[PDB]
Write a protein that binds this DNA or RNA. Structure first.
Lengths: 106, 106
DNA sequence: GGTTCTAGAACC
DNA sequence: GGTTCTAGAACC
């Protein structure tokens, strides 16, 4: 049976009504958390038994997800935090059959 | 010369105008972050070159601070996150002479 | 030294 | 398995 974390993550990303906060990236190769602070306080506790981004991120890394790092190539944008993007080779828009390949690290 | 992190942490805690966000606990044995989300976005970047609670906490642990853990002894308070308290034996209200005993772990 | 990303371990 | 707290390592 699919781990709850992955089922819930898929649901979160795929669901349109959460797309202000968490959504597929534009080519469906990763997912975005667009408003980390409101995602954590308003969305996480509806799905998990916490409201901590750090605990969500710990689960992402536990299941092999990696952060897509965004650098400041140019002007420093202090006004805007760089959304927050995570990727797994087997977490892909339109490819729910691949989810079974994702494994918890221990 | 005192590490910038410790100088800035002392300043943050001691300064009255930041006390909505970060302040001594009531017996001066620890410090409190009362509004983690606004502390991180409004206060951290005035002092450090980031606005991430996780990066602040990493520095706390790097210098030997530990979280004072708060358990739900009774009713679950989902509406209210449990402020956030950190302690170091040598970080103490009215005892700035002790700060020199705090050491970075590597 | 400071910041970021990820993971080990304890606790649940 | 999930959540929390802390630390190793890479990058700056």
């Amino acid at each position: 049976h699919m781990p709850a974390f992955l089922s819930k993550l898929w649901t979160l990303v795929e669901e349109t009504h959460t797309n202000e906060f968490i959504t597929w990236s534009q080519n469906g190769q990763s997912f975005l958390v667009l408003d980390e602070q409101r995602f954590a306080k308003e969305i996480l506790p509806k799905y998990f038994k916490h409201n901590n981004m750090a605990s969500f991120v710990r689960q992402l890394n536990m299941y092999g997800f990696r952060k897509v790092v965004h650098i400041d190539s140019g002007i420093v944008k202090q006004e805007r935090d760089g959304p927050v993007e995570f990727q797994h080779p087997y977490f892909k828009q339109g490819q729910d059959d691949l989810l079974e390949n994702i494994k918890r690290k221990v």
